[model samples]
Target: NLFVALYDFVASGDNTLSITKGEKLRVLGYNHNGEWCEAQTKNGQGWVPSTYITPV
Candidate 1:
């Protein structure tokens, strides 16, 4: 699924993806908790907080 960042976030770990507000993301999968998801941008890929992105 496609989503867009609602807020800016810096990656807290090597497995997380940094995101800028208004950038589009492609969701690859979600964690069991649903609090985080694996997503990708043109330049990067990793997990990101679900709350920080909105369906697009």
Candidate 2:
């Protein structure tokens, strides 16, 4: 399974995560908030930070 950014987020609950197609990202499980999800990525994944992203 592959994961990508959904938007840009400066901090938790900042709504800054970006999602894109074919974007390089690591599948890191569910969101930290625990909202019935499956794939998730974090700062440790080694991808472009929340500075650039928008959501699929």
Candidate 3:
């Protein structure tokens, strides 16, 4: 369902994604210089800074 959740976050360099604050990610590839966007869930993955995330 291309799920994604996280109102705010912080993970830069040596990327480590243990997201909090309404976590439920799934989207997996959108890495551009525009920011960051490479997600996964279950409390692990990496990169995810594109406006924090939206839509479902």
Candidate 4:
């Protein structure tokens, strides 16, 4: 499944990572940043820049 970047928002609640369609993310590890709830695909767990996404 391909996911796309929507927008960016401050992590107000717990476990909040919204992804869209047609985008490919790389999930390197679990909670690598300690802030991101989840990773993308498989290339180093980390949060994508908000400037690149559009947020759902």
> Which has the higher TM-score value, candidate number 2 or candidate number 3?
2
Cα RMSD, model 4 = 8.8
Count backbone overlaps in model 1: 0
Ranking by lDDT: 1, 3, 4, 2
Q: Which lDDT values do the candidates have, in the order given?
A: 0.93, 0.41, 0.69, 0.43
Top candidate on lDDT is: 1
- What does candidate 1's lDDT look like per residue over 1-56, in tens digits? 88999998899986999999999999999999999989999769999999999989
lDDT for model 3: 0.69
lDDT of 4 by residue, 1-56 (tens): 23445444343444444444445554433354443434463333345444444323
RMSD of 1: 0.8
Give the candidate number with the greatest TM-score: 1
lDDT-best of 2 and 4: 4
- Of the two candidates 1 and 4, the one with more favorable TM-score, higher being better, is 1
Alpha-carbon error at 50 in model 2, in Å? 14
Badly placed stretches (over 4 Å) of model 1 are none
How far residue 38's Cα lies from its native spot in candidate 1, in Å, is 0.4
The TM-score measured for candidate 1 stands at 0.92
